Every structure is written in C-alpha cells, then in structure tokens.
Design a protein around this ligand. Structure first.
Ligand SMILES: *Cc1c(COP(=O)(O)O)cnc(C)c1O
Ligand SMILES: *Cc1c(COP(=O)(O)O)cnc(C)c1O
Lengths: 399, 399
C-alpha cells in the first residue's frame, strides 16, 4: 500500500464502467478544431456544445494577430514572477483593459482564474474571519477557503433567507467575506445578487462576486450578473477568468478599494508563480477590448440560448431552469444508463456536450450540460435540436 | 476597519521606504524586450540578469514558429478543463514530450508550476498521512501542505541528519511524502539528494522532487539534480515548470507509478481550471524537445555561471556558495541601505538583478540574486563584471 492506494475503489469502479465498452468522458481529445463550434473527435466531425467559448473569441482574427505579434516582439514567455522581472508592458496594458471593461480603479491579473479565487479568498480572510458561501460554490472558491484559516459558513443553495439567517448569528466584530457567483454553472441559473448583496451589506460583510460565466453578456457594459442586478457600487471585489468569454488563459480580480494594490505584495498565488506569456496577455487584452463592443455576438448568444432552451423543453426534456437564465442549459435525467446512452448517442451523431454525475450533482440526478456559443449559427441550433430529438427517442428519454 | 486593514503596517512601511526616493523593486516594467538578455526599463537599455530563462528558449525560432502555427490552427485558447472539452492534440503531444524528456511512463501537465505543487501535494497526502519538507521549501510546496489535511513535518534546512531523525519518529503505517527541491533558489546551492533519497526510502516514504531550477543543465539527459545525483530509480514523482528553462507557462508532474493517471480525475488544481492555450502547449512541446539536445546551451550556461561566480568573488564580493553550484549566484550584503544602493546603482548603469530581503531571507541578510542565461555572451559576462565592479566601489561594498 502507498499514497495512491486510497484511489483503488475509484480505479476499480472506473475499470468496471469501461469494461462494458461505453465511451469514456475523460478521454475526449480534440484532434483538430475547425472553428469555435466544430472539432474532429475520434475521426468524426462534431458540433461543440460543451465549451465556455461564449463569445466565440478563440478564432477572432484580431485576437490571433495580436498573439502572433506578441510572440515576435516579446518571446514565448516572461520567465519570472510579476513582482520580479515578469511584468512586461503587455501585463500592465491587460490590467488597463480590465479597468476600462469593469470601470474600476484597480485590476490584478493572475495566471489562472483558479489562482485568482484561491489567492483572493485565502488572503482576504484570516484567523478569526468568516467566509460565507453558497453550498454549491465552485471548487476553486472552496479551495480558497480550505487553504486559508478562516471560519467557513455554508448557506443553502440560492437561499437569500438562509444567507441572512446565517450571517446574523456570526460575531459582530469578526471580519466577514461573502463569496457569491453570478451564474451557478451546474444548472446555469443566476443568483439573486440584488437581494444577497443587500443582505450582505446589512451585516457589514465585504462582498466578492465571481463573474466568470456572464462576461460580455450580462449588464449594460457586459460586466456580469452583478451589473445587471444593479449592485455594482456595493460589491467590493469581482473575480473573473480569461479562459471563457475572453478565450485564452488567466484570472483577475477588479476593485475600487484604495488599498487593493497591496495584494500584489502578499497574495501568494500571485507572487509565487510566473506571469503569463506575452502572447496570452496580448490576446486577452485584445479580446477584452472587443468584448466591450460585442453587441452583435451578445444578442446572438442570447437568441441561441433561448431557442435551444425552448426547443429542448418543447420536445419533452426536463431542464434545470424554467427559462434560459444564462448560456448554460442543463438537461436532467434520472437513470445513469439512460444518461450515458444519450450522451454517447449524441457524440456518435456528431454532438459534444458535457455531463455531470453524483457526487458532483445530488444523489439520483444526472445532467447533460449544454453551453451556447455566440458563433453557433441559427442552422446549427436547429441541427442540435434535431440531434437531441433523434437520440432522445432512440434512448426512450422522450416520446 | 475591513479585511485589508491588516496590511496597514506593510502599506505604511512601504510608503516610508518610497518617500526616501529609492527605486521600487516591485515597479519594474519591461517596456520592450530586445532579446533573452536585454530589455528597455524606464527608458534605459538594460542587461537582464534576473530571469529564469536559463536556456534562452524564449526567442528560439522553432519555438516561436510553433506558437504562431498553433494560434492559426487551434485558436487563442481551449475554453475548457482537461477533463471535459479542453484536451487537444497539443496537450497530449506535450505530455508525450515530457515522457520522452524524463524517460517516464506518465506525464500530467498543469496550467502552472504553482498548481502542479499545490495539486500533487494536496492530493497525494490526506488525513493521517505526513508531508516531510525542508523548512525553507518554496511557497507553492507550503501552500500544497496548507491546502491538504496531512500532518506537516519540517526538517532543518539542508540537514540529512535532521530529516532522518524526524522520519524515524513518525508512525510506521502512516503514509509519508518527502518533498525535496534539487536546487535551493535563494542561494543557488544544491540539495544532497543522494543522501536524502536514501534516508527517505529507508523509512518507506514516497519521494517527490521539484526540478524547476535545473532543467536542461543537470544530469546526463538534463532531467535535474536528482538525475545528476543518481537517484532517478528511487524518486516516485518529479514536479517541474514550463516557465523557466522551457520559456512559457505551465507545470507538470512525471512518474512511472502505474496508478498515476488516476490523478487526472481527482486532483482539484488540475480538474477545476482551463487547460493551457494551444500556443502554450505547442511552444512548450517544441522547447522541451530541443532541450533534450541542447548540449551547447548547457555548456555555455555553466561557463557563464562559473565565470561570473569566480569574477565576483575575486573582486571582493561575498557569495552564497564557495563555487558555482547552479545558474543562480547570490551576493550577500549585511546592510539594507548598501543593498538598495548597489541594486539601484546596477540598475541605473544598465544591469537588472533580483533582490531578496527579510523575512524571505534570514534576519540581517540581504541578497542580490543573479541568474545566468545560456544566451549571455562571453562579452556580456565581462560587461556584467565591469558593472558590479564600478557600482560596488561607488557604494563601498568592495575596495
Ligand atoms: C471557470 C471558473 C474558475 C476557473 O477559471 P480558470 O481560469 O479556468 O482557472 C474559477 N471560478 C469560477 C466561478 C469559474 O467559473
Ligand atoms: C518556480 C517554481 C514554482 C512555480 O512555477 P510556475 O510555473 O512559475 O508557477 C513552483 N515550485 C518551485 C520549486 C519553483 O521553483
């Protein structure tokens, strides 16, 4: 027995699943990517409906040109931390792009969204402080909590009432950080941030909101659900990513707090990692600036999401939301065998979607998760619906 | 008072330092980068001697061509996790390049070296396990310990004797992970891995070694200090980075353990972050493959380090090592004012080096840290020495 022995049940469970010949969801390789919406998987041309490329920026000609030029002018990488030799003009320019996008006085870029959450949460709340978060918060937010030394307070998923109740029992003078997400990624529903922010401010909490899943398509300027909800002035910190709407890699946190820049000196997941390559901050900056004016993509993203949502429910699928609340649509299934047959059937017909399973989902609930892209054409959305209809009938999920 | 108030002493301490008019080491921006060894900083053409671009790969024409082509063929980013839609042919090819470089059966690429340590350490050792590490281990290794739920055992810096003593008191049946680094980055001295690995195996510990600071220039194949030390067959896991010798961004862990691939399913800093952009895995793969045959760069790196080390000690500087043990050379100073005057003097003369300060260093010790590059010419090393001589005399550090 050694340190990997604790994974023996999982390995055994996996080998037994694979022994039945079913397709492995952990072995999908994009051999070739034709566009933001199509890739070759195992020799088959496949519509991608399981990416977070919400605004189709990954093949934007300006983004790509910026990346190439940065490689020529600045090289493949910085070979240093932001706090030593790794801050190039591109890193500062990218932070300026974020300040303009969010209308904030400060922007700190991290090397991943994971690190942004891990760092912000583990640095802001220390011994004697409390972190109050939704039970179903993203793993990176939890990892922030677990890395730090604060007291953790979980409130029932999506319950303003429970948040308020839980905050009220906490000691008056303890520091409190409420961490919220704009869009809950599992089911693609949105948080009631207006109500939750008001409850949080009433108890004197500082508020950090993750807006990774609404960038470019919620709020007047595309800043996220918090802007749409009208609580921009009451949110202390907004964390996001470069790996979804922006279409590259990286994380960030924006804020108007006058002491915010001090985090560059103390935030360990910022300090003790290399800064991003010049090509990454160039592509990110160019993408971010275009996202400020991407009204056409935004409008088409919403059209796509509403069409797919309405179409799926109309043919008999049960969805995680009564209406399209975001660009994520969750199809709910009650049988594991049925869930795998449908997913595999879709894949073999040329459609890729994501899946979710217990214990990530609650017991007895199996999800197919669809995420729309601004670059899905009207015609592709109709094809997608046709594929769901065909595969759904073949597997007995719908009549 | 709020969650940032705890940083008020640091902010005040910083404003008081800056009030004296001294140059800010946390405000260096590379406005333009001319080559691996030169950049424009605040309008001045400056030789870079504070990067971890050890093998000068950042401007390699093949690396750069691979990056550009990947942008064209695969776009600016993957917009998904490795375990969903984010595994492209480039990610698999990059892992194959690592397998070839290290001669291992497995390679897992992470989005940063920070995440590779954080993930490996927090996942391998759980409740009832022990992590045994050098007191002066890298912050990312510590963060791995703090994120996880294992018992932590610090041994005195660089003490084989203390490691052995500490391991012997641990419960016989508890899982044990010894985490070691090949090169200690502060002073640039190397760990006695032959002795430490033997002590670790004698107690039945699994061994993870970080080889971020020797890649391409220690060991027959450039695999690191552990290969040089002859203990390749006894090390279970090797963690490294793409951000130093490789010249991009990313992390990895390589291993021959037959259950190693299971970590892709459970390692949270792998699962819950986007995979790297196609350009990053393309440049990394191309760089890694060239590093396998980079004898010329390696030989010149060592020549540079030995010349600089000998030259600095010969003119009167006190160094962290009696001989050049790596590509890092630490100049030891005993007065903060003198340390800042020398660093600033070098910078204003056109030389950039890194600095270290308490509490990163021990009380009363102030360092200038030089890191050689394979692309520093013989002539630049002579210029560098001339600059150290001039600035050193002006500041009274040397006669
Ligand atoms: C996607 C996401 C992350 C991770 O972002 P990466 O940049 O891919 O590491 C973190 N938090 C939330 C809420 C996310 O949605
Ligand atoms: C540089 C380094 C890291 C961090 O690597 P990044 O890829 O820059 O995050 C982690 N551990 C050690 C020992 C390092 O030297």
């Amino acid at each position: 027995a050694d340190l990997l022995s604790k994974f023996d049940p999982l390995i055994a469970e996996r080998e037994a699943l694979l022994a039945t010949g079913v397709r492995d969801p952990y072995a999908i390789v994009m051999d070739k990517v034709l566009s933001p919406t199509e890739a070759m998987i195992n020799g088959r041309k496949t519509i991608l409906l399981g990416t977070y490329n919400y605004m189709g920026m990954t093949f934007d000609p300006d983004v790509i040109a910026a990346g190439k030029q940065a490689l020529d002018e600045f090289g493949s990488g910085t070979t240093g931390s932001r706090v030593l030799n790794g801050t190039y003009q591109g890193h500062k320019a990218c932070e300026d792009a974020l300040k303009e996008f969010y209308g904030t006085e400060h922007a700190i870029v991290f090397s991943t969204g994971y690190q942004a959450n891990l760092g912000m949460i583990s640095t802001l709340a220390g011994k004697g402080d409390y972190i109050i978060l939704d039970a179903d918060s993203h793993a990176s937010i939890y990892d922030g909590c677990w890395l730090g030394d604060a007291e953790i307070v979980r409130f029932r998923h999506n319950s303003v009432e429970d948040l308020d109740k839980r905050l009220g029992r906490l000691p008056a003078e303890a520091g409190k950080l409420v961490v919220l997400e704009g869009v809950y990624s599992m089911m693609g529903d949105i948080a009631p941030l207006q109500e939750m922010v008001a409850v949080s401010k009433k108890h004197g909490a500082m508020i950090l909101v993750d807006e990774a899943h609404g960038m470019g398509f919620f709020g007047e300027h595309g800043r996220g659900v918090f802007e749409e909800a009208g609580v921009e002035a009451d949110v202390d910190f907004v964390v996001g990513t470069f790996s979804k709407s922006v279409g590259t890699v990286g994380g960030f946190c924006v804020s108007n707090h006058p002491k915010f820049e001090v985090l560059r000196l103390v935030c360990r997941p910022y300090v003790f990692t290399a800064s991003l390559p010049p090509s990454v901050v160039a592509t990110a900056a160019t993408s971010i600036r275009k996202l400020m004016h991407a009204g056409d993509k935004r409008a088409h993203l919403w059209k796509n999401s509403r069409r797919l949502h309405q179409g799926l429910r109309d043919m008999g699928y049960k969805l995680g939301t009564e209406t399209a609340q975001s660009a994520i649509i969750a199809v709910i299934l009650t049988d594991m065998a049925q869930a795998v047959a449908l997913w595999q059937g879709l894949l073999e017909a040329g459609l890729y979607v994501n899946t979710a399973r217990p214990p990530a989902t609650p017991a007895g609930m199996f999800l197919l998760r669809c995420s729309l892209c601004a670059e899905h054409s009207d015609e592709q959305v109709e094809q997608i619906l046709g594929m769901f209809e065909s595969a759904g009938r073949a597997t007995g999920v719908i009549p």
